[PDB]
Design a protein around this ligand. Structure first.
Ligand SMILES: Nc1ncnc2c1ncn2[C@@H]1O[C@H](COP(=O)(O)OP(=O)(O)O)[C@@H](O)[C@H]1O
Ligand SMILES: Nc1ncnc2c1ncn2[C@@H]1O[C@H](COP(=O)(O)OP(=O)(O)O)[C@@H](O)[C@H]1O
Ligand SMILES: O=S(=O)(O)C[C@H]1O[C@](O)(CO)[C@@H](O)[C@@H]1O
Ligand SMILES: O=S(=O)(O)C[C@H]1O[C@](O)(CO)[C@@H](O)[C@@H]1O
Ligand SMILES: [Mg+2]
Ligand SMILES: [Mg+2]
Lengths: 302, 298
């Protein structure tokens, strides 16, 4: 089967369901609240595990109750946490998330400063044991080190190019597949027009560049041409982690088939189904539920 | 010795310090984070205790870590929690708060569905043991019952009239002093213009009506005539709980002096100093620090 490493952040999601996204200063009341594990690499690992892969998550937690809950949750999804570092006297990372009734979200992330950025401890891990290494940009040194070791071992690298304060140029160069979010690509290039931004991103790597655009689907460059995969329409409750699940599914599909069109289509299906349930994980389908959704899509109007 | 009861909510504040208030969907990074006790009545109790009063906090928590932390923190501030109800197998309330570099804040409160509104147990408490009862509007049945019992014992009632979903008319009627937030007054009256809203609020009560307006200060009515107290300019880090601290200070000052202008001025000073430090509580001054701060104005 497919052996996956996911390198990046694991954070506790504190999700507030509101009438509307709070645009202005004031007091608001949440209609509902859920506390669930998140973080791009960690949710991507859960997607890979749901889809049949043998999955390692490699990141950093504190020794607070949050840390032990984050890792226990990943283990219950079939994600192995043996390579995750526990810092002592450390808070784990967490986010406040506001989701409106259309499933659009504001995420405020607080990276715990007790989790050191040092990635040298990754050098003790044998990266040659995996078919694919996924990394998020939210642990910059972990992504740089993991992709360097993965390229040296001849293992495919897949980047979750989300928005982040630092420049991710050097992570993109180490990426076989650099799958940006719309905001991620805009921050990296400083260009708001997606088509021109994607051509600029392509100059940063010999790998493939993609950009996800929520319900507008996914664009990528292949044979010097602009490719496209529409989103699948579903009853959306929560788009939180759509990107994370898309990246997990894309890494599994790319490692399985090598086929960009079929892999992006597969990942779009998995991400669409995730959007139908609250949080990053409850809606994640297995391989069989995904193939039913994708193969019966053409037998009905949707 | 001022004896104060504060009736209302205690919630855990999860405060995110951001570059700017999110004006649209997306991913943002907080530069800093602090987790601190809050809730209007609970922070008002802390202000009262810092200002020398003997303070009871009367609210509801669960038996989760959050609940036990909220009460332990109040005890560490010198607030007595003996009358607070601890519900079995129940989660406590909490808020996510975003504070920008100017100290402006968005608060998202999640009221625990495990905390019963039932206020009948307040009947087992002798309300005559306090000089003043403060209540917030986020525990409506507790405020109604506590104000009813306080009025029956002849004890002064002070309302924190913040924004909340339910109509607070009946709480305002039971209020000797109804001190609204700008949003709270607008929600109650459905009038955006502060001057005509305050006159409309005055028709609901034989008490005094006030409205706080952040750095624009505080307005109130004395015999139909609008009084004003400007805010005191400070280096603002965080306006979270300014209202809460203002109400705690106002209740102590009213119970002490009964001069409205001097009480509002005092409470404005206490609230201004709170704004200089993160969260609802770290910046709360004692009586001596407040008098020093006020002496440098006219
Ligand atoms: N509203 C939606 N409806 C259906 N599919 C969606 C929706 N939002 C996202 N997806 C799927 O998930 C992918 C990634 O979502 P996107 O919002 O671009 O990522 P991120 O959450 O990282 O910003 C999309 O390209 C699409 O395949
Ligand atoms: N930026 C500020 N500078 C000085 N004083 C302030 C500031 N914000 C609030 N205060 C003081 O605290 C009082 C209550 O603050 P306000 O924002 O009106 O309450 P709330 O937090 O309930 O909205 C104000 O009337 C004022 O005296
Ligand atoms: O990427 S961050 O904002 O640092 C963390 C959040 O990202 C998600 O994984 C969604 O893509 C959430 O589950 C995290 O809170
Ligand atoms: O009033 S609520 O929004 O429910 C609770 C918040 O109010 C404050 O006390 C400030 O007024 C915060 O500390 C609470 O989170
Ligand atoms: Mg999205
Ligand atoms: Mg204010």
């Amino acid at each position: 089967m497919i052996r996956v490493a996911c390198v990046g952040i694991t954070v506790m999601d504190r999700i507030y369901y509101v009438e509307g996204l709070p645009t202005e200063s004031g007091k608001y009341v949440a209609r509902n609240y859920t506390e669930v594990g998140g973080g791009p690499a960690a949710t991507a690992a859960v997607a890979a595990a749901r889809l049949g892969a043998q999955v390692d998550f490699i990141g950093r937690v504190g020794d607070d109750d949050t840390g032990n809950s984050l890792l226990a949750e990943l283990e219950s999804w079939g994600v192995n946490t043996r390579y995750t570092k526990r810092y002592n006297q450390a808070k784990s990372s967490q986010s406040a998330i506001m989701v409106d009734t259309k499933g659009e979200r504001i995420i405020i992330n607080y990276p715990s400063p007790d989790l050191l950025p040092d990635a040298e401890w990754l050098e003790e891990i044998d990266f040659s044991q995996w078919d694919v290494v996924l990394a998020d940009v939210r642990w910059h040194d972990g992504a740089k080190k993991a992709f360097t070791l993965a390229r040296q071992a001849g293992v495919m690298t897949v980047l979750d190019g989300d928005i982040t304060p630092q420049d991710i140029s050097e992570l993109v160069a180490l990426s076989d597949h650099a799958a940006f979010s719309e905001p991620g690509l805009a921050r990296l290039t400083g260009v708001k027009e997606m088509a021109s931004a994607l051509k600029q991103a392509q100059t940063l790597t010999n790998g493939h560049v993609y950009v996800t655009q929520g319900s507008a689907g996914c664009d990528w460059l292949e044979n010097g041409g602009r490719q496209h995969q529409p989103a699948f329409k579903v009853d959306v409750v929560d788009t939180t982690g759509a990107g994370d699940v898309f990246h997990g599914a894309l890494a599994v599909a790319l490692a399985t088939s090598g086929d960009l069109a079929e892999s992006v289509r597969f990942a779009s299906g998995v991400a669409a189904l995730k959007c139908t349930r609250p949080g990053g994980r409850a809606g994640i389908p297995d391989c069989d539920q995904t193939r039913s959704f994708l193969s019966l899509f053409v037998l009905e109007h949707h």
